Subunit: 327 residues, 4 copies
């Protein structure tokens, strides 16, 4: 055992639509325990030292912020910041936790602000965040009164990052992060909304990825799809020979208009392109909490409209679609 999913098993046991997941999940999480990880003992020691118990004040609507009415002992807060810094690098956020500003590489709040206007309201929806990161968005989803948020992300570190914020929220049992790939989920068809943001370009079969997403949605369930794109008509599809913005293991970068046809082919209805944004270096930068290289380093030093490799520079697109049938 690295980490005990006892409470998740309990949740999905008592869910009519998720119980069938127990037929495959526990053997996968058992095998994940046994693929031991160098840094997980250390990370755990730190997560255990993080103050237990509820905060007084929580805002997950306009931000992800945690405070107490009584200011917390300046000894315990210097220790907390120290603990949280053990989980470097901090890519998705930002978080303000008892007045510690976790300035994450990404302004993941901005991406949320772009998405929210175009989704069906999350009030009482079950959501899947595919490639959820440390689960920043799952917190914002609960902010809009989602019933339940399930994140999946292979990163051991992003699990510890999430369990840290969760512990500091007093162990909120309405969000969970499972250390799985999307390819490991069976055809659950259990979720009202599914988010897949920043995953498609990492997946060697994009069509199979769109189908795997469709397979987690109930009838008339809603898909938010966010991915890096290029400009063009339905025939515009960049597949890089080598790297794109210093990433390796990346595959398809279709135009928003091609991706819209792809989603239709696979069987989605009401497919809408609702935003195209060109990632600025104010949205993605190196920080105090993520000290590695970031977008400035990945652009052409003399042309920010291009990647170092010469390809069109990062452009993110949001598409929203319905799976066929009624809700």
């Amino acid at each position: 055992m690295m980490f005990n999913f006892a409470n998740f098993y309990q949740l999905i046991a008592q869910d009519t639509r998720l119980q069938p997941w127990l037929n495959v999940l526990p053997q996968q999480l058992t095998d994940w325990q046994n693929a031991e990880h160098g840094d997980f003992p250390r990370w755990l020691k730190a997560l255990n030292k993080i103050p237990e118990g509820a905060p007084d004040q929580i805002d997950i609507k306009h931000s992800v912020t945690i405070s107490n009415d009584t200011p917390f002992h300046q000894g315990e807060l210097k220790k907390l910041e120290s603990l949280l810094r053990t989980f470097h690098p901090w890519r998705k956020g930002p978080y303000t936790v008892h007045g510690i500003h976790i300035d994450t590489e990404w302004r993941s709040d901005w991406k949320w602000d772009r998405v929210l206007p175009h989704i069906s309201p999350l009030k009482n929806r079950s959501v899947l965040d595919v490639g959820c990161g440390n689960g920043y968005h799952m917190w914002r989803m609960l902010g809009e009164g989602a019933r339940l948020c399930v994140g999946i992300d292979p990163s051991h570190l992003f699990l510890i990052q999430f369990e840290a914020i969760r512990k500091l929220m007093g162990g909120d049992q309405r969000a969970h992060l499972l250390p799985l790939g999307i390819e490991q989920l069976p055809k659950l068809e259990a979720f009202d909304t599914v988010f897949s943001m920043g995953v498609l370009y990492h997946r060697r079969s994009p069509l199979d990825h769109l189908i795997q997403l469709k397979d987690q949605l109930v009838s008339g369930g809603e898909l938010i799809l966010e991915t890096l794109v290029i400009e063009g008509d339905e025939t515009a599809v960049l597949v890089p020979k080598e790297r794109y913005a210093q990433m390796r293991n990346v595959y398809f970068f279709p135009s928003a208009r091609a991706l819209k046809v792809w989603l239709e082919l696979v069987g989605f209805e009401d497919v809408r392109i609702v935003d195209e944004n060109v990632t600025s270096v104010d949205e993605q930068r190196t920080t105090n909490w993520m000290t590695h290289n970031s977008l400035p380093d990945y652009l052409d030093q003399n042309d920010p409209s291009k990647t170092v490799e010469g390809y069109p520079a990062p452009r993110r697109a949001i598409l929203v679609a319905k799976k066929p049938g009624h809700h």
Copy 2:
């Protein structure tokens, strides 16, 4: 879904020793749902109509009896008896439930009275009842303050019977009946005591059966083993060509002394023969709640010391043993 094991999954999720069972159990129970059963929709309709919520008085120590301080409406009690009668045939008991006497084929209380004197105390033990029936014994095990009782029995009907009594106990979550064969359990090694009573003669590989039991016990954990036997030394082993007391799918009937060597060979310690009883027709008979044939039908009409087939008549033996190692508790 015939029956939702939601609460069992919840229990074993939060147990250190049982959580690994989630790696194999749920796909088996899923497949059990999908092997449809003729009578289970009907049985369920009846189980749902049984009054839910706690009784005032429960005795699971000297019997299995349920009563309220407030008398029940004679309308509601005639309806209850009617509901409970739909779960015919009632083989293991007996139960007294709001003054309705379920006269079961078996005096399963008597077998309990024979066993209890020879076991380590159940106070705070986790127990596995292999071939538990409707779980009569699991109730008596909680009566002796067992922490947790898990029953294994393939019978769809014995599940309905159990969930009926459980509902009438106010949904006691300390006993559970899973519709599995012992052969379907992995090597859990999670149980303080394991009962296997009336199973060994049904199992084509007796030694594999003893090992499957040993594999559910923690270190120094205790096995109660009850089975039909014959008289003789350690080389006395009846394997019937025919049937034995009308039973069709039946294999080994060793002497208590042979079974004791078998248990030793397989690796058990402190193996003790603690009782041999010749099943009387007062212990196993036809009744108003089990109207089918029973032991008097299965004996020679001329000689009750023999089965109709001519073999020595039913003789049940209790053996108790320890799995190697020290028991921490």
Copy 3:
């Protein structure tokens, strides 16, 4: 058993590089037998009535033609033509077999004439023809003195078509057609050359298709890849919402220049675009041996530069590449 692969099992048993295929193939072929097919009993009856034993003259170099020095009885030849016609529709060819011209829908000879100029010599190579059809090309591959030809094609009919020509070649054991999808092959890395012609647009994951091909090649082994394309730079990739030329289960149509980058990304070396051809209605037409609809039906009746659906009309591209490493031969 629909068809017994006894001889294939025998071949691959005695091959160093193919024997590991016995770990997975036979259970797949067993399951294929048990997925019964309406027409296969009939087709078999006809294949069995085709004269067995060697012809005197075989040309598999400039054509696929079979003749005898002794004229055949006009009784036996009318019967043969009748037998061969039961295997309608005949899509890949053409074949001339004891003077019977099988006018196949496709001039598959022409596609061969386009390919041969750009390949490393097949003399003594083991080849895999992925989506081989009735195996027309595997015959031409042996014509260039390939050591061994293995075809993969799910079509029950294309198997019957192949075994017919093979029987009429006197049971040539150097070509074989297995009724598999490419997705069913393990990572054999056993083949000098691999052909994939007319398959990529049928496959929902094109990159996984290119990798599955790379996985059948030995080091420095050669891939011929032929597929429908569009014009454009490396970002030109048609994925049709509708159908494309009446085809229903169809996915990626990249430009030859995009497909070349795709092959590079996946890890191929020396990737060359060696030909782009616009399928004429002289290369693909209805015939007396393929009486169904064909390309003229699938084009805009007003504009042969477009499909009925309005997309650019069929354009086939040949690419040739090397799998990394030195090729020992």
Copy 4:
């Protein structure tokens, strides 16, 4: 690869009844290759140095003897005896190979002489020898003109012993030894006669063993069963607490009369007890070619009617039965 079963795969490919075995056999033999063995490289080096090519004269009818009309060079024969001695210990035989007498621990010829009188003639039968040893009996089975003999035995050494004699028979392709347990065979129902001699007492589920045998027989196929027994009626079944004649991992020793009921229960017809023999120290002894301990050592030093452990001394029984249906 330790050993290439290429020729066996070829045989069973072209057999109508054995081809289905290819659905499971090759993965098992692949896994057997990968469970490497300390001594198999060495044993192989020796097997490779054994003279190739046919002998002139072969008797597999009254013995297992190999000779040439021209006596073989006394240099090459001293080398052969040396090679064959590398395969110590030699338990089943005896063999006479170019005048080298392999005096095996067991007079396995005697056991054959006891069996032969009671079996249906092997002329053109396919046979399975379960726990075949080095395959001595499979040679005698071909002596009676069996069509094909398949032996199964987990012992790496007994495989090398067999391939040695086979090579010295000029690579006879009508007998084969697969390094499998009986439990590894599927329900082939492909064999005219099945021998199981000296296996039952080693098998923790005797009934499952009898069923596994029944499952390799065609309809009205014949089972020879040989095993150690005790005296008594159908209720006489010795299961030892510890060891029996120094063996561990031994289980049931029923009386011949109990075993006969067991065979009936499992579904065999025409079950016949055709011989009970008390193993003498002339049938099983230490030798020149098997220098380890043997039966004299396993008996009570002062009572040869008992094992060292005190149990009745070794007694072997032959039973013959038909699987239901016609041939």
